[PDB]
């Protein structure tokens, strides 16, 4: 069907119309009817097929229908494994419920714990959470979650991979069970995913497999790229690459939306046109920018790995991967192909750091061929003085750089492939110099028995 | 009075109530002591008496009441400080197992 035939509220229907979606996808078509019916649902679905709306529609529908207020409590909780995925879901949430009177909030790892506690005490009806911080809040901070009617788990396979088994087990135990509707999505159906389904879903859940069994497998026809550069000149590489191959097609994958916006507005100041696509932009203008980039013959566009997942990459000459990938495996196998598409022939590039040679080791293990690219210290441009001046002078650039630096550090620290991309080997002075700081901003990297002691045998603890 | 009777006894002073009952065990580890006689007052009125073997051994808690100490001029008796006493026990102490562990302590 489409979206109007479905009997939704006028506010949400008008909001979706303003977003610009008209024809629904498959996951929406098969997932909205039973979610509005109230049936607990499990879905084998891809990311970027519209599942974000597929589970954010019913929660907002019911919240508005039964009229939550900030004093009521928590309402719908959706749990996601990645900070950028939480941010994407949060942006979709604002663009969905920009007309409703309910409140939405995101509580994620690495953020200000006291600020999140204030948020939760004030009251959020649509909460989007990363499992560790969510468990910490549910165990420690005082906030109302007794009126929890909707629970959504997104990418349980990615969650159980990272390693939040114990954490999830306690979230499902603490969170209330009566008259609760749960929506569990995954791409793979492993035994851990099954255990989750059994522990969370009520007996006899409704299954939606919009996956495709005929999955194309990669072969020895993948050619990858690496440019080993120091931490303090990665942006100088990016600038030189873009300014020299301005006339080609380049797509640059970053780590975080704050980094995308900071680099967008910074490159606007340093006078080279780049197209922008991140979570803070409106969906309509984001679609327009993607459409015009896909049709335009020449240009450079910057977006995140999550956007790369959720969008269909056109024929492009150079796919640059600036910050470390969220899921390393998919980049070396999936996007490597997307680079060489249709009748054309494209090129790939992974910016790499002298602290991350374990990545090249993993590639030898994966036996995929790799070509390195020397860069002449002569042909590197030097706009560092101008960069430092702009950052120290313009206040908006300063906040943008602070947010981008904080988000980059947090993503690097919370990256799964820790043996390669461990944060304690980074040089924060060099990272801040690359972002445009003479001195690094303050960030938090982390974010025998007693004699005669015996185990924990009861009490009135809380 | 009890510490005066006990020649293998080290007397100690007030113990923090916000501390831990096994922080008491490492306190006893400081003075190479395998038995703990702990006096714990409630409301400043009611006594509670703990007998414990410090490393692993069993412990027993009693409620202590009816206390008529020495220095009361109606006892008419006196004895040496530190002399080995005769310990008199009861058939109940020998028969009930909990009374047997109490007797051993």
């Amino acid at each position: 069907q489409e979206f109007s035939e479905l009997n939704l509220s006028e506010k949400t229907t008008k909001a979706i119309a303003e977003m610009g979606f008209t024809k629904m996808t498959e996951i929406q078509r098969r997932a909205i009817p039973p979610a509005l019916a109230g049936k607990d649902v499990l879905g084998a679905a891809k990311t970027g097929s519209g599942k974000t709306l597929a589970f954010l529609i019913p929660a907002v529908e019911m919240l508005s229908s039964l009229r939550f207020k900030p004093r009521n409590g928590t309402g719908a909780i959706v749990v996601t494994p990645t900070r950028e995925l939480a941010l994407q879901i949060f942006g979709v949430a604002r663009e969905l419920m920009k007309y409703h009177s309910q409140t939405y909030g995101v509580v994620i790892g690495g953020a200000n714990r006291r600020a999140e506690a204030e948020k939760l005490g004030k009251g959020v009806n649509l909460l989007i959470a990363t499992p560790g911080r969510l468990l910490d809040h549910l165990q420690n901070t005082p906030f109302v979650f007794k009126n929890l009617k909707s629970l959504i788990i997104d990418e349980a396979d990615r969650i159980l991979e990272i390693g939040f088994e114990d954490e999830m087990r306690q979230i499902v135990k603490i969170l209330p069970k009566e008259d609760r509707q749960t929506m569990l999505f995954s791409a793979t159906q492993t035994t851990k995913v099954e255990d989750l389904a059994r522990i969370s879903l009520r007996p006899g859940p409704l299954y939606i497999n919009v996956d495709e069994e005929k999955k194309y497998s990669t072969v020895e026809g993948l050619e990858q790229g690496y440019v080993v550069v120091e931490a303090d000149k990665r942006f100088l590489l990016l600038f030189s690459f873009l300014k020299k191959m301005a006339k080609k097609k380049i797509i640059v994958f970053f780590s975080s939306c704050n980094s995308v916006k900071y680099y967008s507005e910074l490159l606007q100041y340093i006078d080279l046109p780049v197209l922008d696509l991140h979570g803070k932009q409106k969906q309509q203008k984001r679609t327009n920018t993607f459409f015009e980039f896909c049709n335009a013959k020449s240009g450079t566009l910057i977006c995140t790995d999550v956007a790369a997942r959720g969008l269909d990459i056109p024929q492009v000459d150079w796919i640059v991967q600036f910050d470390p990938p969220d899921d390393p495996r998919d980049y070396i196998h999936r996007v490597g192909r997307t680079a060489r598409g249709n009748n054309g022939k494209g090129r790939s590039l992974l910016f790499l750091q002298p602290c991350e040679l374990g990545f090249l080791a993993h590639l030898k293990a994966a036996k995929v061929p790799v070509v390195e690219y020397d860069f002449p210290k002569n042909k590197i441009l030097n706009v560092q003085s101008q960069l430092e001046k702009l950052i120290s002078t313009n206040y908006y650039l300063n906040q943008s750089a602070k947010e981008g630096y904080r988000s980059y550090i947090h993503a690097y620290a919370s990256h799964s492939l820790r043996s390669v991309f461990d944060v304690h080997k980074l040089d924060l002075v060099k990272v801040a110099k690359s972002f445009g700081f003479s001195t690094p901003p303050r960030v938090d990297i982390t974010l025998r028995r007693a004699y005669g002691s015996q185990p924990r045998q009861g009490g009135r603890y809380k | 009075d009890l510490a005066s009777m006990l020649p293998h006894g080290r007397k100690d002073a007030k113990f923090d109530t916000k501390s831990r009952l096994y922080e008491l065990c490492e306190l006893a580890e400081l003075y190479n002591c395998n038995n703990v006689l702990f006096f714990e007052a409630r409301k400043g009125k009611d006594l509670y008496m703990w007998f414990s073997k410090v490393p692993n051994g069993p412990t027993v808690k009693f409620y202590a009441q009816n206390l008529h100490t020495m220095e009361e001029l109606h006892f008419q008796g006196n004895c040496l400080k530190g002399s080995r006493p005769i310990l008199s026990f009861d058939a109940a102490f020998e028969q009930e197992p909990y009374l047997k562990v109490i007797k051993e302590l």
């Binding site: 390393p328 025998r448 005669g452 015996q454 185990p455 | -």
Partner: peptide, 29 residues
């Protein structure tokens, strides 16, 4: 020993451990 391609390489006591009287866990010092 990089067994799988892009997954991580998997990686004192002053007491002994025995059983309690209630089928629990007991620490002996």
């Amino acid at each position: 020993e990089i067994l799988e391609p892009f997954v991580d390489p998997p990686r004192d006591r002053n007491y002994r451990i025995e059983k309690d009287a209630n089928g629990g866990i007991r620490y002996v010092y």
